[PDB]
Design a protein around this nucleic acid. Structure first.
Lengths: 183, 261, 261, 261
DNA sequence: CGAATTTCTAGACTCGAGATCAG
DNA sequence: ATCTCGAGTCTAGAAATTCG
């Protein structure tokens, strides 16, 4: 077992031992950790790493975990159906996509949409892009409600590519055990 | 089989230069009445149109209606290689994906044959609804271009006040604010000097100056530019391509609440 | 309230272009005598002075002496928008913080009105003691600009060593060493080609070429540079603003011990 | 000692401009006959030759043969500082350590002196052979420069083929393929505005556009450019240096890979 | 009125500045 | 100890002004 895992399993073992710990957790809170156990060794280790990283979207091309699996896509689907992970299909917020893009990729997008300062810093471009989504449109799309930000979203999603983020539900519930270990 | 022989290549050069910095791809609609371009902008806010008629072409022949997707940047690059006195001879074979440009020479000693690869575009049909306009303004193109270029330095939004005493632009920025006004022309009979203004109802709007700067690239096409606008309708900037057609631009006025942020 | 009406806008355009790359904030001292300026550069090496007598302005009026801290870059950008034949009408009113530039086209068909935002600058006065110089040369401005530009490619420190027959704008560098030398001329009908030199004592100095290249941006103002230099005294580069004033540049000579290390 | 007094400095300016972007270091084989320069380029693909006969210079004195290995970029930088109407007086002492340039002025009122640091280089002499050629074409230099510049916008492979009534420059890039044909005309009295082709056998070759664009930098030197080529023989591009000498450019043809298979 | 020129601008280069970490 | 990243810095080419 990889070093980070046994120490991780220790946390669940002692907490599930003392009878007072589950008294503050409801039935589904005990069921979600149960689903963790029935995950395979490959599936269980993947959730370990993303737990210690910051809660944000991460590109699929940016995970290189050779110690668990050379091809992680079958593993991601295992967490995807279990609800521990969510894919880009739920990525609907414009602000989340813009910060997900890299610095040079955002510059190229700014050139296409004719931004005021295409060669600014990443922060200045994001607010300009978000501001741009509030502008009106022309008969190009009719006029019922501008919705120009939707046009940016489809272009931005294609640029970003595949990405996943730790689901808050499992994250918030699982973040509720390691602190009581520290007392 | 499409075959159009245009004697003045400068007109095509100017048109392609005007469309190159605002548009990437276009649906080069062709028919038996003349080229009728209607394309888009990437930012999805400005709409362009072009209506090169058939009588202007020296020789025209079109068996069937065609739709072509031509890379505007590539066509502009090809056209830049031709001089301002050649004889453009656009010709496309039936379902051949080739726009065979041919440039002749006034001294018939050097001919150029080119070819381009067509593209497949999702033809989106848009029906522009004609409407009445309140303020109609026509003025020399050079003055309008100079006004836009001058106001670009100060701010980014221009508040056009189509007042009957003279059109009055205004832009406010962090460096201050500056308003420029013109006056109607009554005695100068030259068509490249009239600033005639038409009134039905007073108007006051706001547009992004970057798009106006993009629009004014077609200044060499004609000397007189016509502006038409009304309440809560897009602005129409129209240039007349001699006796061969016209070139219209569209722009969506900024919302007042946008300036609050 | 202060109001100045200058017929020739080209003079102000050229002055602001000359001062835009050397000074960013200046203290415009306005009195009944006329517009005045004195602000040593941001690098704190070179000193710049400016004078505009009241007789030059077509219409002048001022009640109380003022002091305006104006961003020179913004003023240069604003003046660049003005044309080459407008009638600048600078105006400040009471105790506001706005500079009101007004440009009027000669054909009274386009009136541009701009407004600035003043800022507060500390009034620092540097004493300017009149003295007597050794090498005084009057020579065409274009020749000085060409000499400085040519020597900028070889080295970065000229050695002006006014000689028996004329100046000796030598230099040195890794590529080599250029020894330019103009010949004194006296029998010239026009004063635009005079290179007359007046000597009392011999002189030989050293200056930074970057500052000289900055200084020569004011070539279009006149055509007679009046380099005046003497021992251990800052060099004076003076131009004549038509019949309105003078624009003097002050530059302390470099120390030969600096080049030793 | 070596002293050359050249009335026309523009010739040297143009030559150095032509040679600056293709060759960095060269060896000037100076003899009583004149000035010689053979130096294969940095990429070791193209070769450049040069000859200036002694009779061309207004004054020439060369007691012994030397070999001045000088930096071409620095020489171009120095020469750019000279006017187009100067009288260059290249000089070098018998003790080969420095190069002196004595740029003058037509009004004998301002002279310029410069010095250079020579370098020692390994003089690798390559003996080019004298061979006949199959297709020889002479045509205006402006047309050649325009053709190369136009084709550079499409691909990087020119396929020259002396056709029935002229040349058949043919590029083929990803964007498309452009064929340019020149009509052979000789009835024109002005030989400068004439294209003459002499055939001994058909030929078809291929070349790189970057090298042709580099070659065409010597357009102002002469109006007529002569092209000579044969089977598996480098292309020869020759420019006549007024009545002084000639400037030849060499380029080995591209190797046509077995792309058809 | 086209070529040359200078100036402005897109692009590549080098380096300081986060982020994580191990105890 | 490992790593990526963005941010400032510098050139060469396109565009605007001017001279001829």
């Amino acid at each position: 077992h990889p070093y980070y895992l046994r120490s991780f399993l220790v946390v669940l073992k002692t907490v599930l031992e003392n009878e007072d710990d589950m008294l503050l957790f409801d039935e589904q809170e005990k069921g979600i950790v149960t689903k963790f156990y029935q995950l395979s060794a490959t599936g269980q280790k993947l959730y370990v790493r993303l737990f210690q990283r910051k809660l944000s979207w991460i590109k699929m091309t940016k995970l290189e975990y050779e110690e668990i699996a050379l091809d992680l896509t079958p593993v991601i689907e295992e967490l995807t159906n279990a609800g521990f992970l969510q894919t880009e299909s739920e990525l609907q917020e414009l602000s989340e996509v813009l910060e997900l893009l890299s610095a040079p990729e955002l510059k190229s997008l700014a050139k296409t949409f004719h931004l005021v300062n295409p060669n600014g810093q990443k922060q200045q471009l994001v607010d300009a892009f978000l501001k741009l989504a509030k502008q009106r449109s022309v008969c190009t799309w009719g006029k019922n409600k501008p919705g120009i930000g939707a046009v940016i979203l489809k272009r931005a999603k294609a640029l970003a590519g595949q990405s996943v983020r730790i689901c808050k539900g499992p994250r918030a519930v699982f973040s509720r055990i390691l602190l009581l270990f520290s007392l | 089989m499409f075959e159009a022989r245009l004697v003045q290549g400068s007109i095509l050069k100017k048109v392609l230069e005007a469309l190159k910095d605002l548009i990437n791809e276009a649906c080069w609609d062709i028919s038996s009445s003349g080229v009728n371009l209607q394309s888009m902008d990437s930012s999805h806010v400005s709409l362009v149109q072009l209506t090169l008629r058939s009588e202007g072409f020296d020789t025209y022949r079109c068996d069937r209606n065609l739709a072509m997707g031509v890379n505007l940047t590539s066509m502009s690059k090809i056209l830049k290689c031709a001089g301002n006195e050649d004889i453009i001879t656009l010709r496309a074979e039936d379902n051949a994906d080739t726009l065979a440009l041919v440039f002749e020479a006034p001294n018939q000693e050097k001919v150029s044959d080119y070819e381009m690869k067509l593209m497949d575009l999702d033809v989106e049909q848009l029906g522009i609804p004609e409407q009445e306009y309140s303020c109609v303004v026509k003025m020399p193109s050079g003055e309008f271009a100079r006004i836009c270029r001058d106001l670009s330095h100060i701010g980014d939004a221009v508040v056009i006040s189509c007042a009957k005493d003279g059109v009055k632009f205004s832009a406010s920025g962090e460096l201050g604010n500056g308003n420029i006004k013109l006056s109607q022309t009554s005695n100068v009979d030259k068509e490249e000097e009239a600033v005639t203004i038409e009134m039905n109802e007073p108007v006051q709007l706001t547009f992004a100056l970057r798009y106006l700067n993009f629009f004014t690239k077609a200044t060499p096409l004609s000397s007189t530019v016509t502006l038409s606008m009304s309440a809560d309708v897009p602005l129409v900037v129209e240039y007349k391509i001699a006796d061969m057609g016209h070139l219209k631009y569209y722009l969506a006025p900024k919302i007042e609440d946008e300036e609050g942020s």
